[PDB]
């Protein structure tokens, strides 16, 4: 038939790894992003961008190695290898943090390709595309945290660096400079994630503990076969158990599984809204009434004020080394300390 | 308010003493108490018991028994 | 004008009502401190 | 500490959605009772 038809037939062939049309975007972008992350964590340093050593070649381990964000002198530059910052020089491109931009951009396009892959495989198998809508959660997380937040900030420098200790540093930095725990959208995200973990554990235990005795063996994993027209566990027994134990219970399996889908997705989207708010320093950092009460009453103290003091400590005692481009020099007298309050 | 640090510096965590739902909390027991058992009858006065974070110990002990009972009741 | 064939009844079960009331009250509890600032 | 606007926001934000849900539930129960 037509070239398209033949190419569509070949891309849709039942192989060990499905390719599809979405594969043409997914496989190269994802492969390049993963390979660039490995290259950065193995060879590329962060000495000229953050003043830090972040490579196995420099002596770092799995936790401390990272693909660090570009220098704060680069701004929000695409940092193309052929761009005016690097001008085709691979060494200078790696030294200025261009590999982080490489990984971030090719990884965003890889996430788009994987979402399209979910859509295409769902369209093939004939099922509703409730995947690639669940994956919209992780997509929104990545877009808000690694793309929208640095774009709202001064440069790519304040984006999370692709590493374990780098991610921990990003957590503490955001807590210090934004008080992100106090953000209600982050609270909804935490509620969504913890509720999703709760739902996963409780649903697994409930199904495992309400199975029908469909086998003579003590180990009950053999009693199930995929070509079953009968349910493998008792929904009525589970509903009775949770209705007389917790006071309320699921009676519809569809609604239960949609809820288990909905909770983490809603949590991730709320957290994404919160991070988008943080991108412009539009943060729920402080309560004005509590600050006014503490200002006119030295004997008034709550855990919120202690959190404010802790965030001040993170900001002052990390600013010097976390933002070396600013050339922050703080004398010991100006550094906040509990002893001097 | 509860003198959590045991330094005569009370920390407020109640709605009536100026807290909101987010800042509100039941302050842990006083550092002078340590992990000593501190029921109501082991305090000189009810004001002393409230000042040293006794309700925190009460809630924690009864809650931790209740959740053990919840495990057993699920079984 | 005339009878519209696209009219459909709308139903909200008790479970949905309670889910909605719980969501609204929980959101109010969460955001009241921030609105009162 | 904020003005009655903060109070208006919390109380109306709570009530407008609450009364909508209650009206919808009452309408659904009314249809159920009428058809049975």
């Amino acid at each position: 038939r037509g070239w398209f038809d033949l190419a569509d037939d070949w891309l849709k062939r039942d192989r060990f790894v499905f390719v599809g049309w979405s594969g043409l975007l997914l496989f190269p972008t994802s492969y390049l992003s993963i390979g660039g992350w490995f290259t950065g964590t193995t060879f590329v340093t962060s000495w000229y961008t953050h003043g830090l050593a972040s490579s196995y070649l420099e002596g770092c381990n799995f936790f401390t190695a990272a693909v660090s964000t570009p220098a704060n002198s680069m701004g929000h530059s695409l940092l193309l290898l052929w761009g005016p910052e690097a001008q085709g020089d691979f060494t200078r491109w790696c030294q200025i943090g261009g590999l982080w931009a490489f990984c971030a951009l090719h990884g965003s396009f890889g996430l788009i390709g994987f979402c399209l892959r979910q859509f295409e495989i769902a369209r093939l198998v004939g099922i509703r595309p409730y995947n690639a809508i669940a994956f919209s959660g992780p997509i929104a997380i990545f877009v808000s945290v690694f793309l929208m937040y640095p774009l709202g900030q001064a440069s790519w420098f304040f984006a999370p660096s692709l590493g374990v200790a780098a991610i921990f540093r990003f957590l503490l930095f955001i807590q210090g400079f934004h008080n992100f725990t106090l953000n209600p959208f982050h609270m909804m995200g935490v509620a969504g994630i913890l509720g999703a973990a709760l739902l996963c554990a409780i649903h697994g235990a409930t199904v495992q503990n309400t199975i029908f005795e469909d086998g003579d063996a003590a180990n009950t994993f053999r009693a199930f076969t995929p070509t079953q027209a009968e349910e493998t566990y008792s929904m009525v027994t589970a509903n009775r158990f949770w209705s007389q134990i917790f006071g309320v219970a699921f009676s519809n399996k569809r609604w239960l599984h949609f809820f288990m889908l909905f909770v983490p997705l809603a949590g991730l989207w709320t957290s994404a809204i919160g991070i988008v708010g943080l991108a412009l320093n539009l943060r729920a950092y402080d309560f004005v009434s509590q600050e006014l009460r503490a200002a006119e009453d030295p004997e008034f103290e709550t855990f919120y004020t202690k959190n404010i003091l802790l965030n001040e400590g993170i900001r002052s005692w990390m600013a010097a080394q976390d933002q070396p481009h600013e050339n922050f020099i703080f004398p010991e007298e100006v550094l906040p300390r509990g002893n001097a309050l | 308010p509860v003198d959590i640090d045991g330094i005569r510096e009370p920390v407020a965590g109640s709605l009536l003493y100026g807290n909101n739902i987010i800042s509100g909390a039941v302050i842990p027991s006083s550092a002078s108490i340590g992990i000593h058992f501190y029921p109501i009858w082991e305090a000189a006065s009810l004001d002393e018991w409230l000042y040293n974070g006794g309700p925190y110990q009460l809630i924690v002990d009864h809650f931790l028994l209740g959740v053990c009972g919840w495990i057993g009741r699920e079984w | 004008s005339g009878p519209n064939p696209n009219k459909q009844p709308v139903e909200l079960n008790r479970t949905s009502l309670f889910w909605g009331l719980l969501l609204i009250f929980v959101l109010a509890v969460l955001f009241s401190s921030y609105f009162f600032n | 500490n904020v003005s009655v606007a903060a109070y208006l926001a919390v109380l109306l934000g709570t009530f407008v959605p609450v009364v909508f849900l209650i009206t919808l539930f009452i309408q659904s129960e009314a249809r159920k009772a009428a058809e049975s």
Binding site: V248 | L16, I21 | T15, F18, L22, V29, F36 | -
Partner: peptide, 30 residues
């Protein structure tokens, strides 16, 4: 005055939980 709003919201949430538990739609086999 905001303490009255906080207490009202908490009591309303607890009452919603109470009515959801003890006035739910009774599950039936159909």
């Amino acid at each position: 005055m905001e303490t009255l709003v906080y207490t009202f919201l908490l009591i309303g949430t607890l009452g919603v939980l109470f009515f959801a538990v003890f006035f739910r739609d009774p599950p039936r086999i159909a």
